[PDB]
Amino acid sequence: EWEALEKKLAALESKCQALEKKCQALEKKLEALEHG
Amino acid sequence: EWEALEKKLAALESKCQALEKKCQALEKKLEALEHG
Amino acid sequence: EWEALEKKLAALESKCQALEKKCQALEKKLEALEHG
Numbered sequence A, B, C: 001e002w003e004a005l006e007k008k009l010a011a012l013e014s015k016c017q018a019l020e021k022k023c024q025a026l027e028k029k030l031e032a033l034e035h036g
Protein backbone atom coordinates (compact mmCIF):
# COMPACT_ATOMS: atom_id res chain seq x y z
CA GLU A 1 0.00 0.00 0.00
CA TRP A 2 0.98 3.66 0.08
CA GLU A 3 2.60 3.55 3.51
CA ALA A 4 4.30 0.26 2.70
CA LEU A 5 5.70 1.79 -0.56
CA GLU A 6 7.09 4.80 1.37
CA LYS A 7 8.85 2.52 3.82
CA LYS A 8 10.15 0.27 0.98
CA LEU A 9 11.65 3.28 -0.81
CA ALA A 10 13.34 4.50 2.42
CA ALA A 11 14.74 1.01 3.09
CA LEU A 12 16.09 0.78 -0.47
CA GLU A 13 17.68 4.28 -0.16
CA SER A 14 19.48 3.13 2.98
CA LYS A 15 20.53 -0.25 1.41
CA CYS A 16 22.08 1.64 -1.55
CA GLN A 17 23.86 4.13 0.69
CA ALA A 18 25.32 1.16 2.65
CA LEU A 19 26.41 -0.53 -0.62
CA GLU A 20 28.09 2.68 -1.81
CA LYS A 21 30.15 2.75 1.42
CA LYS A 22 31.03 -0.97 1.08
CA CYS A 23 32.26 -0.31 -2.46
CA GLN A 24 34.35 2.64 -1.27
CA ALA A 25 35.94 0.28 1.29
CA LEU A 26 36.65 -2.26 -1.49
CA GLU A 27 38.16 0.50 -3.63
CA LYS A 28 40.55 1.48 -0.81
CA LYS A 29 41.81 -2.07 -0.60
CA LEU A 30 42.10 -2.40 -4.37
CA GLU A 31 44.06 0.90 -4.59
CA ALA A 32 46.48 -0.37 -1.93
CA LEU A 33 47.14 -3.39 -4.17
CA GLU A 34 47.36 -1.32 -7.34
CA HIS A 35 49.93 1.04 -5.75
CA GLY A 36 51.84 -1.60 -3.71
CA GLU B 1 1.49 6.50 -12.66
CA TRP B 2 0.86 4.65 -9.41
CA GLU B 3 1.19 1.17 -10.89
CA ALA B 4 4.20 2.21 -12.92
CA LEU B 5 5.86 3.62 -9.73
CA GLU B 6 5.24 0.32 -7.87
CA LYS B 7 6.86 -1.65 -10.65
CA LYS B 8 9.79 0.84 -10.89
CA LEU B 9 10.47 0.48 -7.15
CA ALA B 10 10.39 -3.35 -7.39
CA ALA B 11 12.75 -3.29 -10.39
CA LEU B 12 15.16 -0.98 -8.54
CA GLU B 13 15.05 -3.24 -5.42
CA SER B 14 16.02 -6.19 -7.59
CA LYS B 15 18.78 -4.21 -9.45
CA CYS B 16 20.32 -3.23 -6.08
CA GLN B 17 20.14 -6.77 -4.74
CA ALA B 18 21.93 -7.97 -7.92
CA LEU B 19 24.59 -5.24 -7.51
CA GLU B 20 25.16 -6.23 -3.87
CA LYS B 21 25.86 -9.83 -5.00
CA LYS B 22 28.19 -8.61 -7.80
CA CYS B 23 30.13 -6.58 -5.23
CA GLN B 24 30.38 -9.60 -2.91
CA ALA B 25 31.85 -11.55 -5.87
CA LEU B 26 34.36 -8.73 -6.48
CA GLU B 27 35.26 -8.71 -2.78
CA LYS B 28 36.01 -12.46 -2.88
CA LYS B 29 38.44 -11.94 -5.73
CA LEU B 30 40.04 -8.92 -4.07
CA GLU B 31 40.49 -10.86 -0.79
CA ALA B 32 42.21 -13.68 -2.70
CA LEU B 33 44.70 -11.10 -4.00
CA GLU B 34 45.10 -9.40 -0.63
CA HIS B 35 45.85 -12.74 1.09
CA GLY B 36 47.88 -14.32 -1.78
CA GLU C 1 4.31 13.63 -0.58
CA TRP C 2 3.45 11.98 -3.88
CA GLU C 3 5.58 14.28 -6.03
CA ALA C 4 8.43 14.12 -3.53
CA LEU C 5 8.26 10.26 -3.59
CA GLU C 6 8.42 10.25 -7.43
CA LYS C 7 11.50 12.44 -7.38
CA LYS C 8 13.11 10.35 -4.58
CA LEU C 9 12.62 7.16 -6.60
CA ALA C 10 14.15 8.77 -9.73
CA ALA C 11 17.12 10.06 -7.71
CA LEU C 12 17.68 6.59 -6.20
CA GLU C 13 17.47 4.96 -9.68
CA SER C 14 20.17 7.31 -10.90
CA LYS C 15 22.36 6.80 -7.75
CA CYS C 16 22.21 3.00 -8.29
CA GLN C 17 23.01 3.29 -11.98
CA ALA C 18 26.06 5.44 -11.05
CA LEU C 19 27.13 2.87 -8.42
CA GLU C 20 26.83 0.03 -10.95
CA LYS C 21 29.22 1.91 -13.29
CA LYS C 22 31.65 2.63 -10.40
CA CYS C 23 31.68 -1.09 -9.58
CA GLN C 24 32.34 -1.98 -13.22
CA ALA C 25 35.33 0.42 -13.11
CA LEU C 26 36.57 -1.29 -9.92
CA GLU C 27 36.14 -4.70 -11.56
CA LYS C 28 38.30 -3.62 -14.53
CA LYS C 29 41.10 -2.65 -12.18
CA LEU C 30 40.75 -5.83 -10.14
CA GLU C 31 40.83 -7.98 -13.32
CA ALA C 32 44.04 -6.23 -14.40
CA LEU C 33 45.59 -7.29 -11.08
CA GLU C 34 44.16 -10.81 -11.24
CA HIS C 35 45.57 -11.33 -14.77
CA GLY C 36 48.87 -9.41 -14.27
Ligand SMILES: [Cl-]
Pocket: none
Ligand atom coordinates in the same frame (compact mmCIF):
# COMPACT_ATOMS: atom_id res chain seq x y z
CL1 LIG D 1 41.36 -1.61 5.97
Ligand SMILES: [Cl-]
Pocket: none
Ligand atom coordinates in the same frame (compact mmCIF):
# COMPACT_ATOMS: atom_id res chain seq x y z
CL1 LIG E 1 35.73 -17.18 -8.70
Ligand SMILES: [Cl-]
Pocket: none
Ligand atom coordinates in the same frame (compact mmCIF):
# COMPACT_ATOMS: atom_id res chain seq x y z
CL1 LIG F 1 41.81 2.91 -15.67
Ligand SMILES: [Pb+2]
Pocket: A022, A023, A026, B022, B023, B026, C022, C023, C026
Ligand atom coordinates in the same frame (compact mmCIF):
# COMPACT_ATOMS: atom_id res chain seq x y z
PB1 LIG G 1 31.19 -2.61 -5.75
Ligand SMILES: [Pb+2]
Pocket: A015, A016, A019, B015, B016, B019, C015, C016, C019
Ligand atom coordinates in the same frame (compact mmCIF):
# COMPACT_ATOMS: atom_id res chain seq x y z
PB1 LIG H 1 21.58 0.45 -5.31
Ligand SMILES: [Zn+2]
Pocket: A031, A034, A035
Ligand atom coordinates in the same frame (compact mmCIF):
# COMPACT_ATOMS: atom_id res chain seq x y z
ZN1 LIG I 1 45.12 3.41 -8.56
Ligand SMILES: [Zn+2]
Pocket: B031, B034, B035
Ligand atom coordinates in the same frame (compact mmCIF):
# COMPACT_ATOMS: atom_id res chain seq x y z
ZN1 LIG J 1 41.70 -9.08 3.52
Ligand SMILES: [Zn+2]
Pocket: C031, C034, C035
Ligand atom coordinates in the same frame (compact mmCIF):
# COMPACT_ATOMS: atom_id res chain seq x y z
ZN1 LIG K 1 39.77 -12.66 -13.72
